[PDB]
From a paper:
This receptor shows high basal activity in coupling to multiple G proteins in the absence of any known endogenous agonist or synthetic ligand. Here, we present the structures of ligand-free human GPR21 bound to heterotrimeric miniGs and miniG15 proteins, respectively. We identified an agonist-like motif in extracellular loop 2 (ECL2) that occupies the orthosteric pocket and promotes receptor activation.
We finally refined the cryo-EM structures of GPR21(m5)-mGs and GPR21(m5)-mG15 complexes with resolution both of 3.1 Å. The overall structures of this mutant (GPR21(m5)-G protein) complexes largely overlap with those of the GPR21(wt)-G protein complexes with the receptor conformation nearly identical (root-mean-square deviation (r.m.s.d) between GPR21(m5) and GPR21(wt): 0.68 Å for Gs-bound and 0.90 Å for G15-bound structures). Intriguingly, we found the overall receptor conformation of Gs-coupled GPR21 was similar to the inactive GPR21 (r.m.s.d for Cα is 0.55 Å). We found the overall receptor conformation of GPR21 was closer to GPR52 in the Gs-free state (r.m.s.d for Cα is 1.48 Å) than to GPR52 in the Gs-bound state (r.m.s.d for Cα is 1.79 Å). This analysis prompted that G-protein bound GPR21, in the absence of an agonist, may adopt a conformation highly resembling the inactive state. Remarkably, an alpha helical extension of the cytoplasmic end of GPR21’s TM5 covers a large area of the G protein-binding interface, resembling the conformation of TM5 in Gs-bound GPR52 and Gs-bound β2 adrenergic receptor (β2AR)18. Especially in GPR21, the cytoplasmic end (starting from A2516.34) of TM6 cannot be observed in the electron density map likely owing to the high flexibility in this region.
Residue numbers in the entry:
A (entry chain R): 25 to 234, 252 to 324
B (entry chain G): 6 to 62
C (entry chain B): 3 to 340
D (entry chain A): 9 to 63, 201 to 254, 265 to 394
E (entry chain N): 1 to 126
Write the structure that this text describes.
Amino acid sequence: VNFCLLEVLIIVFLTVLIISGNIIVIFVFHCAPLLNHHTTSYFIQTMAYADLFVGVSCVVPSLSLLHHPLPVEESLTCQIFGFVVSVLKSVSMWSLACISIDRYIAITKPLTYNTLVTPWRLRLCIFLIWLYSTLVFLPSFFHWGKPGYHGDVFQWCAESWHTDSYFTLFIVMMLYAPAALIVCFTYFNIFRICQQHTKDISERQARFSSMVLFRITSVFYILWLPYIIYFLLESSTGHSNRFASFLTTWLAISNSFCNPVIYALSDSTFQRGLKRLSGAMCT
Amino acid sequence: TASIAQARKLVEQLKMEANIDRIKVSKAAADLMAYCEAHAKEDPLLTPVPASENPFR
Amino acid sequence: ELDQLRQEAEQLKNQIRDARKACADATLSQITNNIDPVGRIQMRTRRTLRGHLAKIYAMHWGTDSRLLVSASQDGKLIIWDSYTTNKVHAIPLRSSWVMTCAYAPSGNYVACGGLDNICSIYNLKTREGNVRVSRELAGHTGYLSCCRFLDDNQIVTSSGDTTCALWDIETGQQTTTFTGHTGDVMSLSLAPDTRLFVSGACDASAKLWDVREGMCRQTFTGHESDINAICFFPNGNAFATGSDDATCRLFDLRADQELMTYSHDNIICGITSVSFSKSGRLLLAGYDDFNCNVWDALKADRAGVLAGHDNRVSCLGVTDDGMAVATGSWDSFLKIWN
Amino acid sequence: TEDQRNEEKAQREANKKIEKQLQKDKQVYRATHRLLLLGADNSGKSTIVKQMRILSGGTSGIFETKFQVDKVNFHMFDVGGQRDERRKWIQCFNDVTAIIFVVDSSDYNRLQEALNLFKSIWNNRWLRTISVILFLNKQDLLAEKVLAGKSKIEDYFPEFARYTTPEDATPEPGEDPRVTRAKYFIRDEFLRISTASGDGRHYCYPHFTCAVDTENARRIFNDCRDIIQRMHLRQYELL
Amino acid sequence: QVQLQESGGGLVQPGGSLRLSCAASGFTFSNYKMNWVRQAPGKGLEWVSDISQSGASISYTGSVKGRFTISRDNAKNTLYLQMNSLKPEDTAVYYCARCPAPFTRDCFDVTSTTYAYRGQGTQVTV
């Protein structure tokens, strides 16, 4: 049980940080007076809830690796697990893109922003994100492919369930590429406008002589992209290193606790809210 | 004419301030301490209220 | 002969100064070796009243100690239940720039005023259940900074045109006008007996007026800058002021001289609201350092800090019961602290 | 206790109705954009608000107008009913998007008072986050005052002797290089204040406005747009 | 109470020299930005000069930039205007105005009404 102990320690080290950080962020965004209802707070709350659900889905691989509870089918577990956490990651990803949408609009339509982004459209938006993420991975239950290498820690489900390139090229074009495209275009426009304004400020200061959201999105994609490239490689032509698959999958899972840590330990005003809520907790 | 009326008004206002029955500030301090020790057993914020009679808990 | 008048005024004010020094036989903090310090006070936000879009600029408590009026700069006069956090009323104001609100001692009426330069009065206990403005008081020529009901019919109104006034609401005219101040009277306080009231101005002077005879009974000048906030001591003898000097001052009317100076080295923002607890042992002070302080009024020490607001504390009140203290602020929430 | 429960239910119904109305009002409140208009007796700010107004009569203290440009509501306060002291009622405007500042650019003796007012507004601890859309008014009269001689701008501002024009627009100010050298000297006089303080929190947006100018609504529009953009880019701290 | 008394002045022929001194009592003199404001006859008031809390930051209006010089001492609570190369345009009442608040760089001191922390006055005639 040397590899078993190593993998279960990795899984525990993921899941305790995941559940603690997401519980903390959920209680913060539920108890914050000023940060109660924004145009981005709904999406950030959805990210926190999705990653908490990632944690409550990642609790059961620990049990199967240590205490081993199995259902009657005994193989359906990955069929739910490798489904559900996958959907949750999609629920995370698109929500970040949705953030990258509205802040883009907040810069592009700055005076009509509250006319374009209302809380009703937020509720419709998170509903559409969850529905679309669940709909894309449904053919996994139709035996048209494995929807990702989550659940490969179950020793049965890796070599018995085979990915399909039709399914992979279906979900990458429909779920994996468009989120990255929306984020890339929106942060391109944000940084272009920031360069124009920095040019203006620098010019006026020349005439008279004598990024917590960015790092959340960036860290998400650079911790998540190895999983995409190795997933597409292993689903394209028949060559799959097991260790690299495990490494990339749990690296992709690992951003779920990274987002609360990056947000709380990197922002200033959210850190002030964190300290004030911790004081109201202790006192 | 206006300056004389302003002088009368200001002198009489400062004069009404002038003939005021002042009391030594030691007695003022004594009166404040007497009033605060009158309500020392009564103020809901000098001593915190028990939670049963608090209408906010 | 203006120089002769100036030296005459200097002679009489030196007579006042010598009378105050004759009063100042011993300082207050010297006599109080035997008093027990209050020690430690902490107060927690029992209810966060969130309903205001813009910065809250005024509040007034109720005499029932439960129904508080609040005024914010979006144009809403919201009457809240402090117990069950229920917005029993929310008036849209005619002009959103209001800087003061009043709650009648009977509880039947509220009032507001500000840069509209008009004191509007709204009838809470209307027959139909829809609150309507009763009458507008349109005699001031500056702005409006503080108003208080003496009763359901007599209201005293501080203003930016240097003059306080007292009005008959049913008539609509000023029963009297107090015109002794030099600039921008910002806060007025009522005595318990409602026979005489105090008011601090931007001329750094806090002045005691008689209600019935319409004259300035006394003048106090200890502060160095604009006075923003005044309240009587609960007995009616003393009163404390909060000025833009970043210090509070406790004067006593019977001695015509300041008694305490509540200040510290590390506080460099002007007091925006002040209040006295029911015993008067606690002086509560809003601030522009985003947090309130609470002081022991009998030793000039910081009893505690009320830090919960993201912006400056624009208003501050304590119940007649003395159980709660509400602090509104410019971050658009009130917070009620026990 | 049953009628007590009815009383609590009626209270909850009142709170629900009030909060629904407050959402209905919060939408309009965030939709509209507040503009504190500031000026003097010399500065033609009434003319400027007239061009955004024309292109009932009340004496309720302060003028408070509405204009609209590309379906955005602009709600502009002229506070003209108070005393000439302004250090307490100016604190009410810490949350306005943009302070308009109209200046009579022709009267050089009044300009030191105008720059002193501008420097007070810039460095006020409650106006340190509000950008100022400076409207240097009466350029067609400043052209007369400089081309006519007999009014010694160098004797009103001694720094004008050692000043040179940095940049110019070609058709409208570019007919004469003297008045242009005058007008940017006025502009830079305010800008020397604006760049002396304020760590990206607020900016001056100076405009050369004639006696009549129909485009001031669009200038306020395109500057408030940049103001909202710059604060959105300022929560990112890319600096 | 707060007082701001001005000493100096009188009558001086054009081209002369003078030095006004403001003794200001009733506050911490160091914590405030002090100002010199004049009132020519038949006019309103108009700000002439100002000096910051430590004396480092100094400004004058666009007429007296080279001629006059503002200075202050905070252990003496005194504010000086050293007037040189005087002019018939310099005949005015001179007030040492105080900025209304401490620890701030914003001032409102030119007001045609009775501003509270303006000095009593001094006829300076040329």
